[PDB]
Amino acid sequence: EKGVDEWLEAINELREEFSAKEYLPETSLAPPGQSKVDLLGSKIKPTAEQLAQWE
Amino acid sequence: QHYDESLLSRYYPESLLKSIKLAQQTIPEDTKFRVSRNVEFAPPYLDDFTKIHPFWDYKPGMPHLHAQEENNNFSIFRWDQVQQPLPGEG
Amino acid sequence: PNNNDEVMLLQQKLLYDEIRSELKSLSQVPEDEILPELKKSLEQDKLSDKEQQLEAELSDFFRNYALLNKLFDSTKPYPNLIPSANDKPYSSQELFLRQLNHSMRTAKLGATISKVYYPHKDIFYPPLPENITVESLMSAGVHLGQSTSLWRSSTQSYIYGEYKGIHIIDLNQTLSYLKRAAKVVEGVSESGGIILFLGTRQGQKRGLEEAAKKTHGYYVSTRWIPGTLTNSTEISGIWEKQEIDSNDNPTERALSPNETSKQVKPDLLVVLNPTENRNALLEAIKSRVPTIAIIDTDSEPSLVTYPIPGNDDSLRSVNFLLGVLARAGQRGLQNRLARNNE
Amino acid sequence: LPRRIVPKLATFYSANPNHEDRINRLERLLRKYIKLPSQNNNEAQQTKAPWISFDEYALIGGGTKLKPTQYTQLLYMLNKLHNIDPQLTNDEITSELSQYYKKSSMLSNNIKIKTLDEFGRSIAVGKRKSSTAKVFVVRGTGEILVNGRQLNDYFLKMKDRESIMYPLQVIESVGKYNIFATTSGGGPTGQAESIMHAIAKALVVFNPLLKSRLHKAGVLTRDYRHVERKK
Amino acid sequence: LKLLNMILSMMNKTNNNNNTLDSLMNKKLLLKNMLLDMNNKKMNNMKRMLNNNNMNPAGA
Amino acid sequence: INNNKYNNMINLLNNNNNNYNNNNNNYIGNINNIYNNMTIDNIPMDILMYKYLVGWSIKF
Ligand SMILES: [Mg+2]
């Protein structure tokens, strides 16, 4: 089952990367090529009918 | 958390163990205590309430609104000194 | 040669954006559309030995780094730039960074500039007192005194002549007085004394702040409170003092309230505009604090310990003289820190 | 080795050494990052500027010595650093600015997005004088009921009826909704305008983009006037 | 298999746009994103729990 | 005192002292940890008000 094989290879590589350093959400789970996240939206997008009425 | 009588009997006086046993048989271990944000019943600090403070508690034997002694069983017969000196350094 | 290294990251960065974009797409879909159909599949599926591997590997992997973890603890430049797609045109931020790249390399191709005066270099690259010439003083306008109608005749001995209705200050004397004043600043700096730079004319703050910084001294650019030295306990007692070692590093020792109320008197006062700071000069006299000041043709020389004859109205002349004094202090500070090392 | 006591701040001999030291720190940042462009969303008037109060800054900026103009100067430099383009900002600027943000962020907000209920109804309450109104707005065809009675029956004055219709007339949705209004207290005018206020507050859920037009028409403002005991 | 079948479905949706980095590179990029969404949830819960206790015992 | 209790809870939460139940209950943990270093010997006498005479006007 390559699906379970590659998933199980992806889960253990992640374990090692997080193990290398103290696991902190902001740092350990930063975006690719990024220093760290801020663990901090409900700005609903107007629907096409809502926006048409406003226009 | 519910503690075995042995542990509780090494820290609290015997007179108070019965109250602790009855409270551990009436309050389920899975009780999710909530915090009251209207009335503050407890003090702002932690206290087991097992020892009577010479200043922050009512003086034993002194008459007051919540005195539990009978009116003929008070033990304050001298009134020349302040009954409750200030706590700590004084 | 090594570009692929960055390319490998960018690939992941693009993939991450794709995963996030479609994670938000599934956040809008109602659960009724996905959940029941998803569960039904499992009701019609049978876990295999391998499937079970991830059934518990992910449970622990999610019960270790998501639930039983510490949420907190008890390419660096421009790390928040949102790069644009390789097909889209440059964003405003990228154009700014693209221009900054040009500014460093190409923008200065073609010629170099020599023998041109740059105002900022008077503050950041002051000359040493031994290299100052009459020409340099004259270039800064130090020789231009006040109108002959405003002459304070007590400065007669500093005057070289009158020209175009103003008195010309003798720069030969200015240089000798400047060197003497500079040596005093260096001595006090090398001895560990407190040097205060006072100037309250518009524009002098920048020079005053840098002079204080490079001599580890102090400055006042806004207003001299009358009584700062004679009435120090009512004005400066509240402000914080600190103890420092011979290297000017804070010792960190907490100070007794007795030590924090004692007057902290400057060891040397430098005044850029003495004609508007009579209060400070008189307090310095009362407090036995030696003082240095720029003395223009309308200014009283005897009110200061070490006068420097010179134009006090031009920011260039003032900053030129201040810079020389500041570097002299810096050399004294560097000589004191060097003797401590060896 | 030898130790001496010296003033902590380079601005010790100034009138307000604490304020001048803080201004100098911010001025250094504005000089080091003079080139960084500013936000173009400033034209869009981003609603973010939570700076500490004059009194809160007086704890760190000299106390009694602090002057209002000195506080104004602090805000002009805090805003300028804050308005640097977010993409091109750096940690140094943010670190310095963090100390000057109101600590109210410690806690959270008390507002939860309003949504239609299980039956598609927007429920809002309104008050005018001593009157109160609880309205149920749903998408419909312009049917209105006041306390179970026809509008012309409950409200005899046409001006009271026109007041109720005004919020729907602003969004040009008079025939797009059914309204079930329940009102109590005060008199006809208080109840009619309390219903007017409640309909306007209930219409924002159907299209939050029309709140600005409702506010501009004046139907989302609670009328504060009440009978005043003569003093 | 929801624990795993929801993540497979996520990649299926991304497969729509895809219409083997996806074997190990995308698979890892997804687990990490989920961990950051499961950590923000726990952070929000802490704020609720702290706002429902008496953070200010003596004055406020 | 207010910052000593907030730190106590923040630490007792970050150390984890049912995920579904981790969205409803607000019980932070043991009473001892929440009130660590807050006793009758240091809290009461420091918060008592009206403890110092600072002014007085007599008239005859
Ligand atoms: Mg002059």
Q: DSSP of C230-249, one letter per residue?
A: TTGGGTTSSS-EEEE-TTS-
Q: Which run of H or E residues covers position D134? A: strand D131-139
> Dihedral of the CA atoms C11, C17, C21, C23 (nearest 10)?
90
Residues of E in contact with A41 (CB under 8 A): none
Strand order, beta sheet including D122-128: D122-128, D131-139, D177-184, D144-146, D149-150
Residues of B in contact with E51 (CB under 8 A): none
Q: If we measure between CA atoms, which residue out of C174, C229, C239 comes closest to residue C196?
A: C229
Measured between CB atoms, does D221 come within 8 Å of chain A?
no
User: Cα(C217) to centroid of ligand 1, in Å?
Assistant: 25
- Where do we find the tokens 């009138």? D15
C317 with C141: CB under 8 angstroms? yes
Beta strand C306-309 with C291-295: parallel, antiparallel or unpaired?
A: parallel
Shortest CA distance from F7: residue in chain E: E55
D211 with D173: CB under 8 angstroms? no
And the tokens for D88?
């091109």
**Contact assignment for B35 to E57 by CB distance below 8 Å:** no
Classify residue C119 by its DSSP letter: T
d(CA C21, CA C76): 25
Amino acid identity for residue C271 in this structure: V
d(CA D169, CA D162): 9
User: Cα(A52) to centroid of ligand 1, in Å?
Assistant: 70
**Contact assignment for F1 to E57 by CB distance below 8 Å:** yes
C182 with C129: CB under 8 angstroms? yes
Q: Chain D 185-214, CB below 8 Å of chain A: which residues?
A: 207-210
**Contact assignment for E39 to A11 by CB distance below 8 Å:** no
- To the nearest whole angstrom, how far is the Cα of C60 from the nearest Cα of chain A? 10
And the tokens for D12?
């010790």
C241 with C255: CB under 8 angstroms? yes
Query: How many Cβ atoms sit within 10 Å of the Cβ of residue D180?
Result: 18
User: Cα(C309) to centroid of ligand 1, in Å?
Assistant: 11
Q: Three-state SS for B35?
A: coil
Method: cryo-EM
Shortest CA distance from F33: residue in chain B: B46
Q: Chain C 321-340, CB below 8 Å of chain F: which residues?
A: none
- To the nearest whole angstrom, how far is the Cα of F12 from the nearest Cα of chain E? 10
Give the mutation candidate from E48, E54, E55, E56 for the B interface (greatest B CB count, under 10 A).
Answer: E54
Residues with CB under 5 A from ligand 1 (ion): C 296, 312-313
Residues of E in contact with D108 (CB under 8 A): 47-48, 51
Taking the alpha carbons at both ends of chain A, their separation in whole angstroms is 53
Beta strand C268-271 with C241-244: parallel, antiparallel or unpaired?
A: unpaired
Amino acid identity for residue D24 in this structure: N
And the tokens for C42?
């499992």
Residues of A in contact with E4 (CB under 8 A): 4, 7
User: Cα(C311) to centroid of ligand 1, in Å?
Assistant: 6
- To the nearest whole angstrom, how far is the Cα of E46 from the nearest Cα of chain A? 12
Residues of F in contact with C74 (CB under 8 A): 11, 14
Q: Can you say how many angstroms the Cα of residue F4 is from the centroid of all Cα atoms in its chain? A: 7
- Where do we find the tokens 């009440």? D226
Q: Can you say how many angstroms the Cα of residue C253 is from the centroid of all Cα atoms in its chain? A: 27
d(CA E7, CA E30): 8
Q: Can you say how many angstroms the Cα of residue C57 is from the centroid of all Cα atoms in its chain? A: 54
- Partner residues linked to D125 by β-bridges: D134
Contacts of C250 (CB under 8 A, 6+ apart): C242, C243, C244
User: Cα(C148) to centroid of ligand 1, in Å?
Assistant: 12
Report chain A's C-alpha Rg in angstroms.
20
d(CA C63, CA C56): 10
d(CA C302, CA E42): 74
**Contact assignment for B37 to E57 by CB distance below 8 Å:** no
Please classify residue D228 by burial: count the beta carbons closer than 10 Å to its beta carbon, then call 0-12 exposed, 13-18 middle and 19+ buried: exposed
**Contact assignment for A53 to D208 by CB distance below 8 Å:** no
Chains D and C touch (3+ CB pairs under 8 A): yes
**Contact assignment for C58 to A11 by CB distance below 8 Å:** yes
d(CA D221, CA D197): 7
C295 with C321: CB under 8 angstroms? no
Classify residue D201 by its DSSP letter: H
d(CA E36, CA C69): 12
**Contact assignment for E26 to C15 by CB distance below 8 Å:** yes
d(CA B62, CA B68): 10
Amino acid identity for residue C135 in this structure: E
